[PDB]
Design a protein around this ligand. Sequence first.
Ligand SMILES: [Zn+2]
Lengths: 70, 123, 54, 101, 90, 50
Amino acid sequence: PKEIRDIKQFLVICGRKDCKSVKIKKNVGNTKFKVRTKTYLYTLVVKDHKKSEKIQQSIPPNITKEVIGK
Amino acid sequence: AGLKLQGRLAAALLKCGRNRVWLDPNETSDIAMANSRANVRKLIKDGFIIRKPVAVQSRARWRKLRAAKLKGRHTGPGKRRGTANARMPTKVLWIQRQRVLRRMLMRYRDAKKIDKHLYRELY
Amino acid sequence: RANKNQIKTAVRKMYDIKAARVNTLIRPDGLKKAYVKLMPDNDALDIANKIGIL
Amino acid sequence: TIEYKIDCSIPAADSIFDADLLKGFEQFLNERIKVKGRTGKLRDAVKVGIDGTSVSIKAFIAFSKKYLKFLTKKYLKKKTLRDWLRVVSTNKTTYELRYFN
Amino acid sequence: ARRTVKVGITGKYGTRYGANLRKRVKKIEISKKAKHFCHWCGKFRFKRQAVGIWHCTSCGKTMAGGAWTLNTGNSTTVRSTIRRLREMTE
Amino acid sequence: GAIKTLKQKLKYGKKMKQNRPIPYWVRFKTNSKQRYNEKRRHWRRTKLKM
RNA sequence: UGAACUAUACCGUUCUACGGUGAAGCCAUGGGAAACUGUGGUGGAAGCCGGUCGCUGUUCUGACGUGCAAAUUGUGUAGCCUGAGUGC
RNA sequence: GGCAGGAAUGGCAAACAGGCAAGUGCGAGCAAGAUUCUACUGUCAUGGGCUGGUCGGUGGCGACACCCCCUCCAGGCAUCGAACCAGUGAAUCCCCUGUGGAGUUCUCGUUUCCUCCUGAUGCAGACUCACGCGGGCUAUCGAUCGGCAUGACAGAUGGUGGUGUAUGCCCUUCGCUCAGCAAGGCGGUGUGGUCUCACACCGAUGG
RNA sequence: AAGUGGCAGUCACUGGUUCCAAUGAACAGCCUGAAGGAUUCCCCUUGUGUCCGUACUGCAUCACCGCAGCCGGUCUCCUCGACUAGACGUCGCUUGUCCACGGACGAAAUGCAGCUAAGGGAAGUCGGCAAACUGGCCGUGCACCUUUGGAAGAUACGGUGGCUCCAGAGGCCAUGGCUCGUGUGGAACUGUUGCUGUGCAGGGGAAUCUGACUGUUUAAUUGAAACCCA
Ligand SMILES: [Zn+2]
């Protein structure tokens, strides 16, 4: 897997035809977005508690946004 | 073989071994009607099959004895079986002595405490 | 002596189903067994009720 | 100054650890709580009180909770109630006296 | 302290093989093990790699000569005779 | 062990297939037929050369 | 016909506790006019020693000797165990 | 078919040597296979289709670093004995503090036992003066200054350039941080009907 | 911000050091350079990855060989805790197992095994055969002879527990906090003199013949003074 440097790289990865789904893990420490392109899972870790909400909004509506958190 | 299949499946599902698995003797019938790993899972969830806690190899004796030995209590000449070099090697004693003394000399050399001629002397 | 490719084409010809993958044993007696994993769109149960496996 | 609780409500509702087995337990604690490895040295370090159906250990000093579990198990053993009750951690700074299922 | 009197490097052989043979192998093995003088770099650095091969750890040179010593005696005289023969038939 | 040749595996499979008792209906064949299978191996008793 | 036991050569490859002892080389140092030399360490050699696995097979002329066994066996006793070692 | 190259026949032979690339849940679920199925997360080798102006360029004093096909020759990796010493890392093992569960409690024991975990992979990061593990090389300076020094258990070095210093440069074993990844696992505590089983909650991501 | 709880054996790597009259493969494959030459400008049986082995056993007490379900033999890998020098030996967690034809009767004689034995101490016997003595470690110390290396652990003497102390080595953070010698020496007390308390664990000395040594050997009666060696 690979990490994402920042949210603009996150968004350009989300804006690809080979990307299919974003998993959203809601941790106590942080919140991370796992984009499943082919050959790689791109994780973006963000610690802010409403930057995560704005990023989940930024995510285009064509992507399956699977929220994981237990 | 009455409950051998169930014991094997339970050992697998419990990650211990058939000698830590406890099959309820008052539920032998329902245990014998298990027939599958799914039903053994059900039985384990129901309590008719248990993972027995690992037996004890307590270390309190060794710990007290070790505290006393560090105090110097059971280390006399009547308790030593191996030669002094086999218990504590003279070579590793020399190695750590040389390292200690060279570290000390080199700390003193880095500071303006000794000349380099005095350093080489003592080295 | 069927290859996995032979088995793929033969499966798609007998029952027009796209095989996602084929794995093959030669079972002890000397028969050759084949698992044919269908594409997710296909349904091995909906195909078996045709073939007669029920 | 940490708080710790031992919840005796489950037995006190069934009249087993209800009336003054609780105060006997409190006195057991006042006897046996060890501070720096000594007994009777719990003055200005540990105060045991009772919020009714649950005992409350207030700790000015670095105190342990597994120690309280140990001492409640000792009191249950001395009162023979351990055959019927279990100490269970239901919350940090809290133990509870439950029944066996 | 001094650990032997006559036996030298031949202490490894202990009591075996005979005194007069341990003598010869001592004379040989002292040289086989010693570092010899490099007439190229001027340092006593030739280590015997194999039989007849001597590598200099400072200069890096690699020379062929001598089973147990860098230069045999016949080699040192052959160099001289060949030199003088070339000198005369220049 | 696990390592085999395809030829060896085919032969072992044929031996497994042969290791079978006579059908029940065979004794009743009018002209008195075989009663039991006299060519029947067992892994313990007799080993295959192979 | 046979080198599946077994003998040996080659190709590839494996295995070798724990100690004793203390060779060369080296460091400090005492003596001496010098050549040389005393002492304390370091170092870790050897078809070196004890000894485990292991291999071999001394002795009891033990067991068994219609055996566990057409050669094994002992709650023994022994040989070697860094090598000309060892197996595949 | 022409031209130009092109000594030295074709193979067999190692399931231990050479030789591309996969890990975890050892599970979704097995009665019985599993680095093979499965869910995730990856890696490798290789093919086809499509879209008057040509010695790749640059930075560094240097060790070097960065971004943007063809022939022949010279080398190298593959690649190689054994033993011994020292170092670092791994897992194992143990200790301290704390948690969760369990055993003992006639007396003592803040006690005894288990658990508290982290794989491949990443053109991710910080060091690499290994300021944790060490070799090589570079530049500057030019030593024994008359008592040579540096660094090692032992070696070992040094005007064929020591010590000291620095944008130092390189490679490698690691280790560490992040992603994988906590959702999993481990020790538990419960709810719901129950069923030919899903949910909830808690408990070191310690030194 | 981004080694580090500890240290033991194993493994890996690293830096070396020793040994050799021994120097410890090849090929495929891959890469770099040197010199030349030449230079039009995302999608596809989820592309291809086809073929064969894939159960279980496997130092087996029943899966192989030995006529067998034979105390024999048979290749490699991993390998915990305590005592200890320990991969010895003894016991224990994990794992696995209670299977070897059994039962009664204190169980004759004889036997095969384990032990003891007064007084004597080889008088037994071809012969000290067999068993016994000794046994680890620490300190002191050690003769003849010698190829100067050894002999040698010569021979020998003393000690060894438990507890309470006294000394004694290092490291990190910053001369205080913390970690900190199971590794040593001394002393006091103590005990029905006894402590390597168990398993384990040299008896020693003095000569003659002989082979120098180490190594080899008749699988299944001879291990030797035989063979080999330098
Ligand atoms: Zn030279």
